[PDB]
């Protein structure tokens, strides 16, 4: 039972680590993608000036 308690403790610690790593990587990917997406939307709105010119 002590072995089991140790196993579950370390499992919980490292499962927290796994889930949190997945999380912050997901949010970092989202931030970068949104930055470039808004940049592209601005460029698409911008090219109309070239077309009118």
């Amino acid at each position: 039972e002590a072995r089991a308690a140790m196993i579950k403790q370390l499992e919980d610690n490292k499962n927290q680590k796994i889930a949190e790593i997945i999380k912050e990587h997901t949010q970092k990917y989202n931030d970068i993608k949104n930055y470039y997406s808004e940049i592209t939307a601005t460029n698409l709105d911008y090219r109309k000036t070239l077309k009118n010119e």
């Binding site: 680590k17 796994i18 790593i21 997945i22 990587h25 970092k28 990917y29 970068i32 993608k33």
Partner: peptide
């Protein structure tokens, strides 16, 4: 090792983007 695999996967995805 599972952590290493996850880190390499996320790094390659970041490089892709």
């Amino acid at each position: 090792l599972h952590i290493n695999e996850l880190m390499n996967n996320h790094e390659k995805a970041f490089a892709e983007l």
